[PDB]
RNA sequence: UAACUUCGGGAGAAGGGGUGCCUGCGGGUGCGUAACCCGCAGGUCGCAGUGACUAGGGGGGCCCGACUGUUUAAUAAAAA
RNA sequence: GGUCAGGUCGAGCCCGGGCUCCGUGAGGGGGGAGAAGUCGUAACAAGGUAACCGUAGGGGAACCUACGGCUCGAUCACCUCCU
RNA sequence: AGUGGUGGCCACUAUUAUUGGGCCUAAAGCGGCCGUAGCCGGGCCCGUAAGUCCCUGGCGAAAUCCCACGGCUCAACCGUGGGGCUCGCUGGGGAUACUGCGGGCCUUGGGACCGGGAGAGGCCGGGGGUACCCCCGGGGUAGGGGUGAAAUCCUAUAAUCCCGGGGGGACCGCCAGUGGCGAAGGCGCCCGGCUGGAACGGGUCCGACGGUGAGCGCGGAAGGCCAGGGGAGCGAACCGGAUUAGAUACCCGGGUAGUCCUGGCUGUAAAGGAUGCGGGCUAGGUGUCGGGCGAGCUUCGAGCUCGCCCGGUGCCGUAGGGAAGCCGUUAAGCCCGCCGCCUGGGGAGUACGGCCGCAAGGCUGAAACUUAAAGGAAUUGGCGGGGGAGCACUACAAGGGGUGGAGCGUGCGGU
RNA sequence: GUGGGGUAACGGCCCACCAAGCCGAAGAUCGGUACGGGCCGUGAGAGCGGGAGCCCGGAGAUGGACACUGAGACACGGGUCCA
């Protein structure tokens, strides 16, 4: 070859080249150690309650345009600052502050975001544990607050 | 052949001879080549030398191919005939000769000074010495507690 | 550009080991 | 590391003690004596180097029996 | 330096074939080599071959019917079972029905069809098509 | 035994533990059991065994001068 | 069961050191975003100063000069290849 | 009777390559060697049967899983039988191709020997000239110098200019070639001694001593750091002048370390063939360097040349490979053994710790966060104080009149 | 290593004496995380991922320490005691 422990008892040197190299993957190495975890507020769980310190608003990026209604929440699990994006339609009706807000992520933790946004990566589902989506939507309930 | 060890270039293209049926072209017999090889030694000639003396003066194609075998000793050629009569050294002529090099460039490396290029090459000998006595000591060619140090090959040498 | 990343964490370097240096 | 230094302690500065250490290191050395080809070369004196073994006492520099000024004396030739 | 040898005798024939060569000249020169030969010369797919014994270096003279398209050694030189043989002719190979994986039992070398009627296999040796 | 370090030092840092007396042994030196030195074990008293006398409290940070030395004999021994 | 002598198992409390993680603090450094402000015109053609590089000093900044290397080098860059 | 969302895991993902991935240019060859551990071993024989294959027998609980049939309306499911189960362990008998080991053997690999020969290989000493510079003397006036133009600057008891002499440092135009040598970094005046390596022909010698090589060890341009010496010219810093809006820069006048030499020390490179090392194998052609060999020519010297042969450096090109450009016996071709390394981009070669260094630095080496691209080759087009060539009168020159002045006429901005 | 105690019993388990060994790069020691297995989830496979109901074996019962009765507990709805 060009390269390998092809031998018959070389093995472990074969063995031990892939292993160092698997590490090269970050979602690899995040998985095992529990990075993932700790990094998330939410602490690898689906969602989280928090109570909304402010409503604030956040601005578009270059290509875009857009003022996008925001929560900043401090969460009731734990006690630590998220940025979590709020849809509706007229949005700020429907959302309430210092009433108990649930957020979800949204997307994967890909890092990534959509243009409109400059770091946003969560999503509010729920305020008073009624979704918002369902005030979106005009086929299952139309807008209340 | 080709190998690269201090070089960028290949080795020499040189074969033995294969004249692997008896000699007959040759009008000397084996007794008296024998008996040319002990004066030869005695003189002062080493053995490499005495086999090259043999190929040209006596015609033989080879050493290996007129006298192999007459002792029960691998690759009876010379030194081994040499060896039963105690005319040789049990470390091999190659060996002796390696090692001989390898003290005098310690000498001139001192005298004068600021050598790049001879001191790479008395790394590169002595280096040499070690792993060919190392197989060497096991065969028996060397005694098993015999050492490659650089001390005991001035020894030899002095 | 290439001269200055290196420099600047030359700077960077130099500058931590100064506040290193003069607060242990 | 110290060489010799570590007698004088951490005192003098570190560059001249540095220096002393190597200097008179090689300084107590034996060192060539073409006279016997026997060798306990010291220095008994200022500028005098003297061979134990011989009994022969010669002049030489502050470090070694011979000068490096001596020798430019020898290489120009007559 | 040269290792694996029987490896390199069988890519020095591939190349000539890729080529369309009428012979080849085989430096290595073993035991190895001549039992390989019988079981290609039986299935037919190398046609005559000439051994020259010299002990200078030992020499092959192949015909090529240009039958063996590839034909080359094991990286691990691995162990093979019985049931095992199938398992390696599908997996590696293109071939299903060329009968030839080449191992190596207590007899010689055999074929992959030879191996199974004799019952026996060994240390896979190699792969012919 | 720490920070620090010119690897010398900091260091006896810091901080812990034992130590009397009697009775039986061992090693070491010697010379023939004389002359000595250094440990061990068992027994055992008091409030306390360096019991008297003798006999350093320790640690860090900042400033200055590197250091040892010298200075207003006789108000000033220092950052001079 | 009393009280006490000798020996063993032996927490809990206290003291100091070692190791390891978490929260956090004046002040300070850079990073990713922002829209608009400020200076220059460097790089991309040769960007009108071909560029890179290691090393060394200096510059408000893009940078510049010295030395050696490199062309992934400008060019009809013409001992020569190129012409 | 779910549908849909978020979070996670597995497939998709040959994005972990054993099946089933790579390292000229996309991310990726270690600056090079040495040799340790480890991995791997030519041919022939022989002993063992450890590895390796076969057979029998002990056993790997039930459940889970498949197939079959049955029961519950049906099916899921459960029963029953058969098959299989992480399936890692055990004992005896046999075989010996292949592997391991012990012994014997052979030259095919490896190292070693001898003779002609070339060389900018290394170390030392001697020495020549060219050119610059300084100083002495002669000669000889008014500008020299510098540039794209300038300016600063330099010069009158005299600079530049021109001759003769002495001293000094430094280096070697021609020679010099697509050329030669060294492991690599690299290596150029000429002469001599000392010394290392290489191609080659003759295998004369040991007889598998072999290959690779984590670690380790070592060399390492330039500049830098330290001491000493040397200092003619050159020139970071620096001090003016110009250019420029200003120059922070290109340009010019001065100028220090340094450049040089020795002793010592540190270690980097686009240290490039961006192509790890060792071997076998796979179309050729031509030139060239040195060797071997047979000739012709001959100034009778391999001086000029041809072919075979051996090694090296170049151009063109096949099979094949590559995304393509290219590569192509000097592989990015076909194989094998081993080492080093990569797995999107930025954060960051940073932080933190350790380790080395005198410092400068070197080695190792993250994470939060953010992103839908980063990159490679070619195609086409526009463009370029990029190159080459050529035309145009709605181009420019030549030439003739005119506008911008004034007043008016007319349109527009503004008011 | 030698002798011995104690246990249901082997044993540096504990003890006296005597020696200076034992262990390590095929990764010791240290930090960190985790009941393990049958199986399960996924994938054509190779492989990856997992330890949940349930069965199997061990471990625990506010934290720690302690004995007695019993073939069997140092005892999951027993006692003593400390926090």
Not at chain 5, 74 to 86: A, D, G, H, M, T
Request: proline share 5%; net charge positive.
């Amino acid at each position: 070859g060009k390269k390998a422990p092809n031998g018959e008892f070389a093995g472990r040197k074969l063995k031990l080249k892939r292993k160092k190299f698997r590490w090269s993957d970050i979602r690899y190495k995040r998985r095992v150690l529990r990075l993932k975890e700790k990094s998330d507020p939410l602490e690898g769980a689906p969602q989280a309650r928090g109570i909304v310190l402010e409503k604030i608003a956040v601005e578009a990026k270059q290509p875009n345009s857009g003022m996008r209604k925001a929560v900043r929440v401090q969460l009731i699990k734990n006690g630590k600052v998220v940025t979590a994006f709020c849809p509706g339609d007229g949005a700020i009706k429907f959302i309430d502050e210092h009433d108990e807000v649930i957020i979800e992520g949204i997307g994967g933790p890909k890092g990534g975001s959509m243009g409109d946004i400059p770091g946003i990566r969560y999503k509010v589902v729920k305020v008073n544990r009624v979704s918002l989506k369902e005030l979106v939507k005009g086929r299952k309930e139309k807008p209340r607050r | 052949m080709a190998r690269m060890h201090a070089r960028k270039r290949g080795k020499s293209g040189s074969k033995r001879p294969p004249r692997t049926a008896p000699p007959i072209w040759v009008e000397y017999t084996v007794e008296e080549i024998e008996n040319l090889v002990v004066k030869l030694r005695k003189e002062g000639y080493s053995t490499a030398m005495i086999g090259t003396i043999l190929r040209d003066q006596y015609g033989i194609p080879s050493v290996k191919l007129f006298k192999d075998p007459d002792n029960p000793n691998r690759n009876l050629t010379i030194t081994r005939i040499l060896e039963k009569h105690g005319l040789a050294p049990e470390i091999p002529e190659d060996l002796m000769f390696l090692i001989r090099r390898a003290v005098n460039l310690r000498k001139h490396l001192e005298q004068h000074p600021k050598d790049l290029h001879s001191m790479r090459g008395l790394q590169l000998i002595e280096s040499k010495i070690r792993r060919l006595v190392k197989y060497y000591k096991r065969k028996g060619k060397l005694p098993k507690n015999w050492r490659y140090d650089p001390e005991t090959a001035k020894l030899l040498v002095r | 550009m290439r001269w200055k990343w290196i420099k600047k964490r030359i700077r960077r370097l130099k500058r931590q080991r100064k506040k290193e240096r003069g607060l242990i | 590391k110290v060489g010799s230094a570590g007698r004088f302690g951490a005192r003098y500065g570190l560059k001249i003690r540095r220096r002393v250490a190597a200097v008179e290191a090689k300084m107590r050395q034996k060192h060539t004596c073409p006279v016997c080809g026997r060798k306990a070369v010291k220095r008994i004196s200022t500028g005098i180097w003297q061979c134990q073994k011989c009994g022969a006492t010669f002049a030489g520099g502050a470090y070694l029996p011979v000068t490096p000024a001596g020798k430019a004396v020898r290489r120009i030739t007559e | 330096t040269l290792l694996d040898p029987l490896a390199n005798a069988l890519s020095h024939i591939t190349n000539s074939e890729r080529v369309g060569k009428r012979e080849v000249y085989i430096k290595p020169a073993s035991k190895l080599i001549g039992e390989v030969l019988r079981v290609m010369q039986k299935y037919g797919y190398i046609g005559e071959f000439e051994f020259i014994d010299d002990g200078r270096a030992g020499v092959y003279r192949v015909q090529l019917l240009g039958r063996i398209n590839k034909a080359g050694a094991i990286k691990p030189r691995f162990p093979v079972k019985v049931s095992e043989f199938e398992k390696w002719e599908k997996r590696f190979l293109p071939a299903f029905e060329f009968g030839i994986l080449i191992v190596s039992t207590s007899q010689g070398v055999m074929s992959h069809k030879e191996a199974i009627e004799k019952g026996i296999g060994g240390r896979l040796i190699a792969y012919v098509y």
